[PDB]
Amino acid sequence: VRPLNCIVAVSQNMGIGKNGDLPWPPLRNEFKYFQRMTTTSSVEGKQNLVIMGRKTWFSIPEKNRPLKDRINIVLSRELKEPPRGAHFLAKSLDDALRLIEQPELASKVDMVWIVGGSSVYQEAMNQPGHLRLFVTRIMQEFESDTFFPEIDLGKYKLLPEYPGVLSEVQEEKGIKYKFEVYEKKD
Ligand SMILES: NC(=O)C1=CN([C@@H]2O[C@H](COP(=O)(O)OP(=O)(O)OC[C@H]3O[C@@H](n4cnc5c(N)ncnc54)[C@@H](OP(=O)(O)O)[C@@H]3O)[C@@H](O)[C@H]2O)C=CC1
Ligand SMILES: COc1ccccc1/C(C)=C/c1coc2nc(N)nc(N)c12
């Protein structure tokens, strides 16, 4: 509800997204990791919350919306009502972050996850205060529309280990990848 966790999978050249779509074919096992981490609350009774840009929301198949057992926030300057299935609409990241700390909510809500789009990652990453970046390194270049903001290594500490995160190289369909956790405190 207070540290901001961003979670992203990123190609070697920093690619995320191609034509409203991922740069790589379905990595189904990497999705498992995304689901367990964003979903796994640390208090029974409380749900984790996800915040995403509007194009990311409509890029999720409708049969998977909202992301289940998580409170779903959509950001949009043009929508007036939440998208069907979304729990909240907010007009800026700041609105979203203020809502989450409200007494009525903060107590239904445990961890806050930024799950994308480029725009939402950039902004989260200009937040002062405690940030974590859960970065899937896809060890391979893929042709991309959009890209992930530079990870300033003076600002972000690579955690050597992190609870429940396995550090060995993984592979699925000939695509190698690994899980990293970065941290910017304060
Ligand atoms: N590799 C990965 O792990 C991930 C990749 N993706 C990919 O990333 C790409 C999507 O990125 P992108 O194009 O940036 O899409 P976004 O999901 O960030 O959507 C951008 C839109 O979200 C709203 N928005 C963004 N920032 C704000 C803000 N600060 N306040 C209010 N509203 C905001 C929009 O609303 P409006 O037009 O309604 O005002 C803006 O047009 C796709 O290719 C997708 O597949 C997505 C998640 C993860
Ligand atoms: C448009 O994509 C999706 C389609 C269906 C369901 C969920 C997602 C999202 C938003 C998938 C992700 C958003 O941030 C992520 N970080 C990592 N490491 N892995 C992921 N799969 C995602």
Curated annotation (Swiss-Prot):
Its EC number is 1.5.1.3. Substrate binds at residues 30-35, 64, 70. PROSITE patterns: DHFR_1, DHFR_2. Keywords: Acetylation, Cytoplasm, Methotrexate resistance, Mitochondrion, NADP, One-carbon metabolism, Oxidoreductase, RNA-binding. One of its GO terms (biological process) is regulation of removal of superoxide radicals. Coiled coil: none annotated. It catalyses: (6S)-5,6,7,8-tetrahydrofolate + NADP(+) = 7,8-dihydrofolate + NADPH + H(+). Pfam families: DHFR_1. Its main location: mitochondrion. Transmembrane segments: none annotated. NADP(+) binds at residues 9, 15-21, 54-56, 76-78, 116-123. Key enzyme in folate metabolism. Contributes to the de novo mitochondrial thymidylate biosynthesis pathway. Catalyzes an essential reaction for de novo glycine and purine synthesis, and for DNA precursor synthesis. Binds its own mRNA. This is Dihydrofolate reductase. The lineage of its organism: Eukaryota, Metazoa, Chordata, Craniata, Vertebrata. The gene is Dhfr.
